[PDB]
Amino acid sequence: MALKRINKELSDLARDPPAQSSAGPVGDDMFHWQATIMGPNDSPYQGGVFFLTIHFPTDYPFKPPKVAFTTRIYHPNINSNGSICLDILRSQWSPALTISKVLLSISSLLSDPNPDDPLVPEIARIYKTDRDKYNRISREWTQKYAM
Amino acid sequence: RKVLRDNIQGITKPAIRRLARRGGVKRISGLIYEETRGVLKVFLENVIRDAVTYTEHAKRKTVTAMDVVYALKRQGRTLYGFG
Amino acid sequence: RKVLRDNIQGITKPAIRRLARRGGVKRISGLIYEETRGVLKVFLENVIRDAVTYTEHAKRKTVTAMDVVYALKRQGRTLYGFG
Amino acid sequence: KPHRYRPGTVALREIRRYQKSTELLIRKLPFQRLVREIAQDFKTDLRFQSSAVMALQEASEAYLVGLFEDTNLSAIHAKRVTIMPKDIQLARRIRGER
Amino acid sequence: PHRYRPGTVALREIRRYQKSTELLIRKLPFQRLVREIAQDFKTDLRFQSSAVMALQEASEAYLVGLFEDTNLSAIHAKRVTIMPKDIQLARRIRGER
Amino acid sequence: RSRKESYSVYVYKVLKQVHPDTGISSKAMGIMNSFVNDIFERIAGEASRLAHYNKRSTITSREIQTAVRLLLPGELAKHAVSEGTKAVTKYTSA
Amino acid sequence: RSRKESYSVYVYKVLKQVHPDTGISSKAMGIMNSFVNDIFERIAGEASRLAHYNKRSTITSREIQTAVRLLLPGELAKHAVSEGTKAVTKYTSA
Amino acid sequence: HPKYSDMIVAAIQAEKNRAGSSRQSIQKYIKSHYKVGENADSQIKLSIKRLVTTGVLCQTKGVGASGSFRLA
Amino acid sequence: ARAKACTRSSRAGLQFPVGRVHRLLRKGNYSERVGAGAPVYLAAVLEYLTAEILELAGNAARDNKKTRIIPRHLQLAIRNDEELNKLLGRVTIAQGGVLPNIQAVLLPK
Amino acid sequence: ARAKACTRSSRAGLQFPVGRVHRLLRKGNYSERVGAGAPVYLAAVLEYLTAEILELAGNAARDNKKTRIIPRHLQLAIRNDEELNKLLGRVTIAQGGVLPNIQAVLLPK
Amino acid sequence: LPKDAIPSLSECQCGICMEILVEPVTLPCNHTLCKPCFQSTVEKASLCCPFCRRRVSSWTRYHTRRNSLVNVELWTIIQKHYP
Amino acid sequence: MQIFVKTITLEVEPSDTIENVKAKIQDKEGIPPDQQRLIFDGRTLSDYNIQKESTLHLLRG
DNA sequence: TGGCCAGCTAGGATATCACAATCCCGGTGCCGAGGCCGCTCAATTGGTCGTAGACAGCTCTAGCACCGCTTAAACGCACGTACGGAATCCGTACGTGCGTTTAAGCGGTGCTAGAGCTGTCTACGACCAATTGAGCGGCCTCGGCACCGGGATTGTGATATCCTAGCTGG
DNA sequence: CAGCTAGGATATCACAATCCCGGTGCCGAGGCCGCTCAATTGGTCGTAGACAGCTCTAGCACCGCTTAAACGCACGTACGGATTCCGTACGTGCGTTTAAGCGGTGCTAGAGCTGTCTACGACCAATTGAGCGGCCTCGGCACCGGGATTGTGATATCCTAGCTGGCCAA
Ligand SMILES: [Zn+2]
Ligand SMILES: [Zn+2]
Structure with missing residues (x-):
């Protein structure tokens, strides 16, 4: 039963809310959650607010959750489907971490994309070749959709 | 469903004596029988474990002669006379 | 092209004694220094006769480390650290 | 007068007897019961071919005879004629079974 | 003067040689023995130094194991002195003869 | 200029995963390579024999499970099978 | 209705060429078949490993000579090699 | 040779041991000083038993013909 | 555009080379054809043994x-x-x- | 209508089936290709051992x-x-x- | 030691399942978790320690054969003060 | 109607494209819509002439 | 009164006879080795076609040879102790045999699980062409560890203090 | 009968060997670097075997009857082990004798890599006869009851030694 752990994590999140990000269930289903994050400061995505989706598999905290973007964004390590290529979601999963750390890591990857293992080859090419162009395009798309 | 146990005493003291006599043993101590029970049980456990694995790899409920032959052959005690 | 047979005496009494010391032997009777070097040459003949036929099959003139490793492996004496 | 042989004299004759015959020396029915009892611990309700049970007995008896030869040699080496459980342990340990 | 009673130096040698890993046989006479043995199967053969080292490692390990078995046989015979009877018994039991 | 292959890189990575701050001698690395090759040959040979016995022509994970069960003893085999099935499951999940 | 094969006919022919007036039990014939299969597998396994070691891809009589030399001991191996070479020579003659 | 009784008494007198002479010491002494036949070991064993039962020899160690003896 | 190259070892979260193991298996004359999950299983087993x-x-x-x-x-x-x-x-x-190791009989006492 | 069939065993004057041995070799996953003389040599060896x-x-x-x-x-x-x-x-x-065989120590004397 | 002789509920609860410790198992990294959470997370993800990434495979195989996994002392202490 | 995926049955009438079916699959199970494919986006069920109780199959991820 | 010789008794060893076990023999009856048959499937036949490997030509790695100092290891010897082995003695464990108790084996019957074989269809792996970065050797440098000299701890061997029983002398 | 002397064990003292610790240089662990070859991806084709359906082998259960084997108990021989005891084959520790080890330069067999090409083996269809199972039967041998040879054990007889008694001599 993952319900006890999910409820405890939600209770702790309510006890210690984050600063720029926010999440929680958007219904009676504790397995399906929506996460709302703001563009980190000094980033091209700054100003826009991104909404995320969560689907908890029925083994938490011993399996990573199904989390992706519901907000269109311009990031190499993120596909057009909103999926996120992150180790704590794929390999670095551990039952001893909190969702807030996951969101902070997501924001860090937004500030620090990894072109070594991207999800869109063109965005990684732009990020490696023209950092200013990536910063412009990410800001433009943040204004277009995340704003 | 026909659970049985305590079959190790089926290897009777005269049977162990007959085996030792073929081995060329003249006089036998009284403590040989229990330790022979133990040794035989260990050997049979090690062989049947591989035989059953061979059978259940082929997905059938019947332990055949070839499975036992392979289980013995992989333990360095090849046995002839069973194909 | 002139190697005599005296090299068996190359394995000295102190060398055999320290080998036994590593093996855990307390004291050694005097007749052992001949039995052990009798055993060692029998072992070496078996290994070398298999290494040399490997080299012959490879049509080579020198005996490589892999030849000895294969010869040991086929005798159930696998050796690590040379390939 | 009750005629009795000296101890060991019939042991030698039965050694000669059993070293000439090739029959199985263990009783087949209890051996099969033992084999099934052992196999209970790996898969339940397993079924055995009679030839498979015979092969198991044929291997086990040969293994035990081979073990007894070496454990008799060890007892002789210790300068006595009665084999004792320490001899079996020594034989198994030298052979590398333990 | 000073005199260690018999056995103690042997025990300290046992402790010393069971802690080290060096090759216990002199390299040059071992090489000469190897070349002498191989000289009958084929003449004028050549050897890699790695091959000779492999042969020496295997032979030393085999001898150490044989001595380990032969010590237990002698102890079983209620002695502390190894003698060729024990070597013969160990070789016979291990199926080498 | 024949390029030869070994498992030194992967052995070093696993060593860094287990003990983050321990080195390994060059001679020990060769021993690990020999160990890896030996185990690979044992398992592959056992799987080939299983496939030939069962009149198959394909070596799948089903054969390798049985080969590991035969070769490795007891709890080591249990853990090895647990590790192998988990990796296959993750590989098929993607 | 599976057609299974053995070496019983050939064993019987050799037995009649050796002892023309000797019978063989059914169980003894099975033992001979098991022995034949065991030796065949030993020789083939040795030859395959030789071919792999020497970076070849064809098993020829040259590998089988060496496999026999490795497997059979002493006088038996010498006689077997002598027998095999003669048969190969005769076969290549025609 | 003189009687085995006298040879045993002579052996114990010759060997000035604090414990007396052992059966083995008596056996060695008799074989080195007298022309004895192959049966000497049995005759010494029998004679020691007799001399202990007659009270000519006092047992100092062991039981029966095994051990060490002194003249009473 | 085709795709980015992700190694099968990274797919399985391993360290040993799944592709190399597959090549060795299918070049070692072990069977006519080789299943897909066999190299994945074998690499995981080898990695576990080496780690142990x-x-x-x-x-x-x-x-x-x-x-x-x-x-x-x-x-x-x-x-x-x-x-x-x-x-x-x-x-x-x-x-x-x-x-x-020294047998207890040989120790002085 | 080409020629009378002669078995390779008859060509070598053997008894064991050279053709069957050849089939077993190539269906045995021993090597990619099999030399022509390999079954002949193997059959000769097996025939000699059985004869012994x-x-x-x-x-x-x-x-x-x-x-x-x-x-x-x-x-x-x-x-x-x-x-x-x-x-x-x-x-x-x-x-x-x-x-x-009985060990000489056990015999009565 | 767990700590302690009186493990107040906050410590007496599992570090993962957060329920009362049922048959807690002390890891070589001195981490304490219940038998269910342990027997899940062992073969569940990576055989590692969820807390400090410690490998436990050798410890686990050492203790499984001898059935020394369950911390008897703390498991008895919990029964004295908690259900 | 009924729709089979090779498993959560059943799904939309012959009125929703592949994208909506994938979105509902993600909502009902958590499997990503685009991961991995559909074997039998902008295509519909009637475009492939998919009848009721048809067996579907559901890389990039 | 003591010593020596002779006779008688007791014990031990050797030889012979008897008893039992395995053995050697035809008789007799059950059934599996081995042969005849005819159908079938695996081996032979002849042709294409591709690549393994033999054979040649070159490159340079590692195996090998004689050389001369500097030790540490081998050797041969003195000495004596603890270990091996031979010799005897006592108690009981393990062999033998008997009567009673137990269940294996036999063979005859009745039941179905599941082994093993067929056919259908498709998911999976071989194979090829194109592509790309993981893994290789080459290069470098520096910290982990071998080597060593100068003090410390533990174990083994030896001596001195306290304890019992036996013998000679008073 | 008592004290003194010889044989014993425990505690304390001294010497030697394995240890350990902080300094010092030396080379291989380990890291980066850039090229390249083996892994990957994307695509075709065919076939291995997963599965479903059907057959009939042989694995299982169960029962009554015969009898041989297992069991357990009585009894005593010969074996294992406990004890003493004696000789030398072992280990220990000197000094003198030796060849292993190292760093050295020099000399090249032969290992090992490439690039050519053709003899050999894979792969194939069409041809057919060796090898298979089915069927049948009788000679080989398992099984039994009668009579024989060899080995072992027990008993009896004979010979040798020991002890006691008697006689003779001093
Ligand atoms: Zn828990
Ligand atoms: Zn931890």
């Missing part, structure tokens, strides 16, 4: 107050663990030595 | 005044010959028994 050996070897090395693993440490790790000892009972390790 | 064992077993049977070879005779033939005994030292023969 290395943990004990590192523990032995640190018990000896050294930071590099030498074959002596491998021998000490193998011959102490019962499972690995039984797995590698017929294996000689070069520069390995033996496990220090 | 049968000769010894027949001698053992006629020493027992019987006409049909039984596993007891095969065991007696194998254990007496040193070469075959070392060749099949790890082989158990069903219904074989043991070679009759």
